[PDB]
RNA sequence: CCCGAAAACAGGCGGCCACCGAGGGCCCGGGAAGAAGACCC
RNA sequence: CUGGGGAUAACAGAGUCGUCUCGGGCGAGAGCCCAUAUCGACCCCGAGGCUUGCUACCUCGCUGUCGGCUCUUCCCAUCCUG
RNA sequence: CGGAGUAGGGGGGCGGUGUAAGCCGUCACCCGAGAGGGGAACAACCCAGACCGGGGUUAAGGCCCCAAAGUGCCGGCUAAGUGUUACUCCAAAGGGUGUCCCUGGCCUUAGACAGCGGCCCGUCGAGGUCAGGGGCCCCGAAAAUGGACGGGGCUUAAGCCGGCCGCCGAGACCCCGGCGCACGGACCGAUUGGUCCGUGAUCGGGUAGGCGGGCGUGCCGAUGGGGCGGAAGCCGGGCCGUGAGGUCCGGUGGACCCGUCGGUAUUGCGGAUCCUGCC
RNA sequence: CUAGUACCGUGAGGGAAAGCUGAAAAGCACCCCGGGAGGGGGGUGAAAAGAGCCUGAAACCAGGCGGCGAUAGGAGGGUGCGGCCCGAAAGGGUUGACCCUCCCCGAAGGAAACACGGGCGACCGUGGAGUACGAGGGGAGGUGACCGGGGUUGCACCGUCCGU
């Protein structure tokens, strides 16, 4: 499987590349999800994500949108948004993905791939926030 | 427009039948004293006493009526030790160690016991667990306990539970557990007179009830009483949203719920059915016996107030996860009268 | 083994042609010269070992993909699978 | 505080059996449980 | 009474906002003197769709009703509580 | 000469009226009576008018993923997720040492602040200060189930301005092969015609409606036939036919049936809150 | 056809449904089960055609056979393929199904590597080259048995019922 280290990567670009990989047919693992970044203003970003988490069906909450509070689930959900999710093809492609906070002992001892199109260095404006900080604001465990 | 609060709470939903009659403890208190953080017994009945008030507030120093519940507590047996480690999300069990000689009745809960499992094997397993804990991987140690309902002739099938240990050192906890395993444990070694406690049990069952009693809904006007709708709610909601909302009160199961109470005071701990007030030794059992429960004969807790459950139900106790700031002293109060007249 | 990946059917976002297919060769040299495969046969194997045969027709884009005709066409069970060039 | 292994990474631990038979149900005497089912002794 | 009509009213809905509810700009002044603590003419610019009108796109046997009782939920342009 | 249908129109542009929406006319491009390719979905906004099977090139538009094709190039702007909207279907008067530009005056080697010292000098001693106009953004800016740039998301962009280079993409256009139609012609029929040739960039959508040719059902006059070695009907299958349909195979069945020419008719059903029977 | 009958209404009056064993009753002797309707064996007849009787359609019901079937979204279909099952005759085919290899022609259309130059650049020009290829049209050599068709289902994309 292709193991990718997310330290210092732009989220949507990472997700686009990963989605195309999955559709072409590869198995992908992503480590260090809490260290990817989101560009823009702290308050706007936090407001957007809080609004997302406070969406719910008014007649039954056991149904309803379940938007994440954890960093790995946030990354996973971005990728899922980038796929055709209402088809067997996309369901399989999404099943072929795994995301992890940190580097678990299992993967300890390997060399990690990167992505050039996605890296903090193509940027010039310092306004940026971390997915771990988003998760802390929302109140999720790591 | 008229305003008023909604009928009932949404904090105890869904209001369904409890998963088990044996209640589960979800959270534990932070205690510095290295001890077992709870006990279990069986509810017996209620009486009242006259005591001199201790707690802060008005009425302090005066003689007051106090209702009392009695809980029979025979000694527990410690049959195991568990180790916990930290996984990706939460805690996960690392391993278990059991005692080799268990009562014949334990097989009524645990149908599949080991065949030979001698003492030397038990000791080797203890040693393995000790060395595992002695490294730094382990994060928590808990005791495995079973009741002994046969001493008091109530039944023969025991209740099996897990209890946490106080402190903040796994090695201290393990030393305690290793000095406890394989033996009987009493309530006086665990609890201290005057404490505040939280009680846990499953409430009395009442079957299916309607919304008037399940939620506090009002009875309609007498015209509706003669129309056929007295004990009904008006409507299930508006045109849009074109569905029934989960917040609308409806009929269903009432009673037999898992519930927790806060800050009930432990008054006294008795032995062999007796209490010592002024040198005397008096019996708590009233003349004729407790209704629907016979004579108390082993050991008992005296708890202030009321507690969930029917009479012969299993009760669990833990110390005060959420106490107030002006606690009363941890000491048995001055009691002037205990009622032991007939209760039926 | 001189193989390629099947990517997609030909067409637009709203319609597709089910007898034509877009292929991505895996070797970097064939990708650098994908036009030197125009006219070559290309085979796909079924779960029962049967063979479906097609032909590379022309180039598609600039990144190194090619277009192929397969009459009789391929099934949807072959869209992220391997194909062998001859 | 209440619900919660159908949490599709559909979990962890200990133990028993298989690779005749572990275990479970009907049945019998009964409630602290109960519309039928279920629950408990 | 019969036959029809949403080719055409009452009626809720759609559209519009003259009117309605809520605001703003500039500054004559009033405020012992001091436009702006407070009030703020004349004249200009708006939001909402909760009042009434205008229109006649939808329904002529969908339900043709007002008010009250009962039950749930949302908005803020906040009466009290911070 | 003969046979009709049409006497409620609508979208879009222009005019009178009206607070406006709408009302009344006007033009005659579209929908009605118009498939296909796009605008998220849209009767009339864009491309574009359709016999059948195939092969290619373009149009509208698009090229980070959903989704075929560029994480494309050069110069510049925006920091507000502003924006990511051709139209259908997007809030202003009034303000802003927020930033990027253009212009025109006035002081300058001791100027325009602060400062040692009451218009003055010793020092901080190098450029500054007023007016207009432009681009982008900001304030002005409040609504009711949970939520809408189509979504994910995007910050030297996947946004905006001025330009540029390649690629993808229709039934449109080019090409090969087949069907028909209109017109003309040659030859040929025991009745409304038939075989073949030539032309068709300038023939191939279609409601109301008009016209031509065919399929099928029951009876009569003639002609040619089949049938207990198994007619009609029924069930399941194969072949021909654009098709309405026809014919053959096997099984069931047990007494009548068909082709051609010419005539006749209670002659073809999915609907009528249709009628009868059955379920 | 036991019809102006049965049946409806105080009455004046209103008014149905219902055809066919077989040439011949040869209309089922005798046995076992069952309280009995009857069932199962045996018989008549060219054929059960069995009096609930010519033929015996559809809707509907049950069983058997085949395919699918408990993580999943559209008016129940359309295009293209894949998997399981049926495939005597009426369709093709040992006078050769299907598959494999090479050779010739070829409409519209139509590349690339590489070499030399222009452009800040994305790219372009010249030559290669009207070559490789190309819908179709023909021919030569090899293996030897199915193909077409039908039922059901899987994937991809499209598709908001009929009449007024």
Curated annotation (Swiss-Prot), chain A:
GO biological process, one term: negative regulation of translation
Oligomer status and interactors: Part of the 50S ribosomal subunit.
Gene Ontology terms, MF aspect: mRNA binding; structural constituent of ribosome
Keywords, ordered alphabetically: Ribonucleoprotein, Ribosomal protein
UniProt keyword Nucleotide-binding, yes or no: no
Record GO cellular component, one term: ribosome
Name of the protein in its database record: Large ribosomal subunit protein uL13
The protein's role, per its UniProt record: This protein is one of the early assembly proteins of the 50S ribosomal subunit, although it is not seen to bind rRNA by itself. It is important during the early stages of 50S assembly.
Keyword Signal: no
NCBIfam families on file: L13_A_E, PRK06394.1
Recorded family membership: Belongs to the universal ribosomal protein uL13 family.
Curated annotation (Swiss-Prot), chain B:
Lineage per the UniProt record: Archaea, Methanobacteriati, Methanobacteriota, Thermococci, Thermococcales
One term of GO molecular function: RNA binding
Protein name: Large ribosomal subunit protein uL3
NCBIfam families, A to Z: L3_arch, PRK04231.1
Keyword Ribosomal protein on entry: yes
SUPFAM superfamilies documented for this protein: Translation proteins
GO biological process: translation
Task performed by this protein: One of the primary rRNA binding proteins, it binds directly near the 3'-end of the 23S rRNA, where it nucleates assembly of the 50S subunit.
Native source organism of the sequence: Thermococcus kodakarensis (strain ATCC BAA-918 / JCM 12380 / KOD1)
Subunit structure of this chain's protein: Part of the 50S ribosomal subunit. Forms a cluster with proteins L14 and L24e.
Hydrolase as UniProt keyword: no
Family the UniProt entry places it in: Belongs to the universal ribosomal protein uL3 family.
Stretches the record annotates as Disordered: 322-344
Top-level taxon in the UniProt lineage: Archaea
Gene3D superfamilies: 3.30.1430.10, Ribosomal protein L3, domain 3 (4.10.960.10), Translation factors (2.40.30.10)
GO cellular component, one term: cytosolic large ribosomal subunit
Keywords in alphabetical order: Ribonucleoprotein, Ribosomal protein, RNA-binding, rRNA-binding
């Amino acid at each position: 499987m292709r193991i990718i280290n997310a330290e210092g990567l732009i989220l949507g670009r990472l997700a686009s590349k990963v989605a195309k990989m999955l559709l072409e047919g590869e198995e992908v693992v992503i480590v260090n999800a809490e260290k990817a970044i989101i560009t823009g203003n702290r308050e706007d970003i936090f407001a957007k994500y809080k609004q997302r988490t406070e969406l719910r069906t008014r007649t039954n909450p056991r149904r309803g949108p379940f938007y994440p509070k954890r960093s790995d689930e946030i990354v996973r959900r971005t990728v899922r948004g980038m796929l055709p999710w209402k088809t067997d093809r996309g369901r399989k492609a999404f099943k072929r993905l795994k995301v992890y906070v940190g580097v678990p002992k299992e993967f300890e001892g390997k060399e990690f791939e990167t992505i050039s199109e996605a890296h903090m260095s193509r940027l010039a404006t310092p306004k940026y926030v971390t997915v771990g900080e988003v998760a802390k604001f929302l109140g999720g465990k790591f | 427009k008229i305003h008023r609060p909604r009928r009932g709470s949404l904090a105890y939903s869904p209001r369904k039948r409890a998963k088990s009659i044996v209640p589960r403890i979800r959270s534990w208190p932070k205690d510095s004293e290295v001890r077992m953080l709870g006990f279990a017994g069986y509810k017996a009945g209620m009486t009242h006493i006259l005591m001199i008030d201790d707690s802060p507030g008005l009425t302090k120093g005066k003689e007051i009526f106090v209702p009392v519940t009695i809980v029979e507590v025979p000694p527990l047996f410690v049959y195991g030790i568990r180790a916990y480690k930290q996984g990706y999300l939460g805690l996960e069990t690392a391993t278990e160690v059991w005692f080799h000689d268990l009562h014949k009745n334990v097989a009524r809960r645990i149908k599949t016991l080991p065949k030979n499992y001698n003492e030397e094997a038990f000791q080797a397993k203890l040693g393995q667990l000790e060395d595992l804990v002695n490294d730094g991987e382990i994060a928590d140690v808990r005791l495995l306990v079973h009741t002994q309902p046969w001493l008091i002739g109530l039944k023969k099938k025991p209740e099996v539970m897990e209890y946490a240990i106080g402190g903040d050192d796994v090695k201290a906890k393990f030393d305690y557990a290793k000095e406890k395993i394989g033996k009987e444990l009493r309530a006086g070694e665990v609890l201290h007179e005057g404490e505040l406690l939280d009680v846990i049990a499953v409430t009395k069952g009442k079957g299916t009830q309607g919304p008037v009693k399940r939620w506090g809904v009002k009875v309609q006007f007498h015209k509706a009483q003669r129309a056929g709708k007295g004990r009904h709610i008006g409507n299930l909601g508006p045109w849009h949203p074109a569905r029934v909302m989960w917040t609308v009160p409806q009929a269903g199961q009432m009673g037999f719920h898992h519930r927790t109470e806060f800050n009930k005071r432990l008054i006294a701990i008795g032995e062999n059915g007796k209490l010592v007030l002024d040198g005397n030794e008096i019996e708590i059992t009233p003349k004729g016996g407790f209704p629907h429960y016979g004579i108390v004969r082993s050991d008992f807790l005296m708890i202030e107030g009321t507690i969930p459950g029917s009479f012969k139900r299993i009760i669990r106790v833990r110390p005060a996860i959420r106490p107030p700031k002006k606690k009363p002293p941890v000491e048995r109060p001055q009691i002037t009268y205990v009622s032991r007249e007939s209760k039926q | 083994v001189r193989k390629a990946v099947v990517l997609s059917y030909v067409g637009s976002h709203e319609h597709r042609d089910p007898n034509r297919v877009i292929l991505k060769p895996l070797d970097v040299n064939d990708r650098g010269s994908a036009a030197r495969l125009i006219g070559r046969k290309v085979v796909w194997r079924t779960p029962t070992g049967r063979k479906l045969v097609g032909k590379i027709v022309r180039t598609h884009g600039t990144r190194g993909e090619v277009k192929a005709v397969f009459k009789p066409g391929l099934p949807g069970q072959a869209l992220g699978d391997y194909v062998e060039i001859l």
